[PDB]
């Protein structure tokens, strides 16, 4: 109800990283969720005030 | 996952009042959470439109 039919703001609920969307798949006596997540890559130093 | 690694918008979940942050502490066969919360103090009447 939460990951698929909308976007979830809960941290580390709909997969690791920031959540974008999800897709369901059936399986014998179970479900498989494919989460699509957003992750920052390359950091850079800076001076702030 | 929610209170510590982020800020939770759920009401009365990460302690009473508006939530700011939390800290974990170990204990024999358990955990202890220290929640830091924000509470308004002194009310004043006003007329609104």
From Swiss-Prot, chains A, B:
Disulfide bonds join 3-14. It comes from the Viruses. Glycans are attached at residue 45. Subunit of the fusion protein that is processed upon entry into the host cell. Mediates fusion of the virion and cellular membranes by functioning as a class I viral fusion protein. Contains a viral fusion peptide that is unmasked after S2 cleavage. This cleavage can occur at the cell membrane by host TMPRSS2 or during endocytosis by host CSTL. In either case, this triggers an extensive and irreversible conformational change that leads to fusion of the viral envelope with the cellular cytoplasmic membrane, releasing viral genomic RNA into the host cell cytoplasm. This is Spike protein S2'. The lineage of its organism: Viruses, Riboviria, Orthornavirae, Pisuviricota, Pisoniviricetes. The chain holds residues 1030 to 1078 of 1273 of the full protein.
